[PDB]
Scaffold this active site. Structure first.
Site, short mmCIF file in Angstrom:
data_model
loop_
_atom_site.label_atom_id
_atom_site.label_comp_id
_atom_site.label_asym_id
_atom_site.label_seq_id
_atom_site.Cartn_x
_atom_site.Cartn_y
_atom_site.Cartn_z
CB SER A 43 -0.92 0.04 1.22
OG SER A 43 -1.58 1.29 1.29
CE1 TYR A 102 -4.92 -1.44 4.50
CE2 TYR A 102 -3.73 0.55 3.92
CZ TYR A 102 -4.32 -0.64 3.56
OH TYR A 102 -4.29 -1.03 2.24
#
Length: 248
Positions: free
Chosen positions: A131, A144
């Protein structure tokens, strides 16, 4: 890219980037198996295995069964992931634990169950979807981003562990993509994206290319890194985000 005759596994293949990646491999000739917690779509043009990647015993049983009947695993794509947003001091215990169990633990289990196969066959490719949040701090996504940074670190050390077996191991770090994540705004305006504009008060840059990612653009980068065209590339992480991290 010609993946005919190659065996490919894709986790998170029920929807989103993992589905688009499995589909791209199918379209390139690969013999594809997809893994996910659920397969709620109407059609999946590849073998499907229901699997909770955060259940170490389930991953062991499923991978051992499948590996007993294949000569080599040419490509492993790790594309499972979940998002639980929150300020760091607001995040629940469940959201913290599940974020790490799925986002890092999932790949860890896949690695534990496939590394011996990669060493025995002597070659193959791994691509792990991280990510852009692993590359820059993101308000609302501390856990996250931390789980994705752990995933990237793990995947790179696995790459070093398998390099002597001729295995290549790389990552793709998508930015905002049309699927999953925060694809819909909290109002009825999606349209001309707010995401493209950025959000300066939270030190979030816009997107220089003026668009968000399509899943196919992530998948096609995965296929490149999985291919013999990337035959000297390992331990790399290609950010696919229209320039939004400015190369970070």
């Amino acid at each position: 890219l010609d993946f005919h005759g190659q065996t490919v596994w894709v986790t998170g293949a029920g929807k989103g980037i993992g589905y688009a990646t499995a589909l791209a491999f199918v379209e390139a000739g690969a013999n594809v198996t997809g893994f996910d917690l659920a397969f709620d779509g109407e059609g999946y043009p590849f073998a499907t295995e229901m699997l909770d990647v955060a259940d170490a015993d389930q991953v062991r049983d499923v991978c051992a069964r499948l590996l007993n009947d294949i000569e080599r695993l040419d490509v492993l794509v790790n594309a499972a992931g979940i998002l639980r947003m929150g300020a760091t001091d607001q995040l629940s215990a469940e959201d913290w634990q599940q974020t790490f169990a799925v986002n890092v633990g999932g790949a860890f289990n896949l690695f534990q169950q496939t590394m011996a196969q990669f060493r025995r066959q002597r070659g193959g490719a791994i691509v792990t979807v991280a990510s852009d949040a692993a590359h820059t701090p993101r308000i609302g996504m501390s856990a996250y981003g931390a789980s994705k940074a752990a995933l990237k670190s793990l995947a790179l050390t696995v790459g070093l562990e398998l390099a002597g077996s001729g295995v290549r191991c790389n990552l793709v770090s998508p930015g905002s993509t049309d699927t999953d994540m925060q694809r819909t705004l909290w109002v009825n305006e999606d349209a001309e994206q707010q995401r493209i504009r950025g959000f300066g008060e939270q030190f979030k840059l816009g997107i220089p290319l003026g668009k968000i990612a399509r899943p196919q653009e992530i998948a096609n980068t995965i296929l490149f890194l999985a291919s013999s065209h990337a035959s000297h590339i390992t331990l790399q992480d290609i950010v696919v985000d229209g320039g939004s991290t400015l190369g970070a």
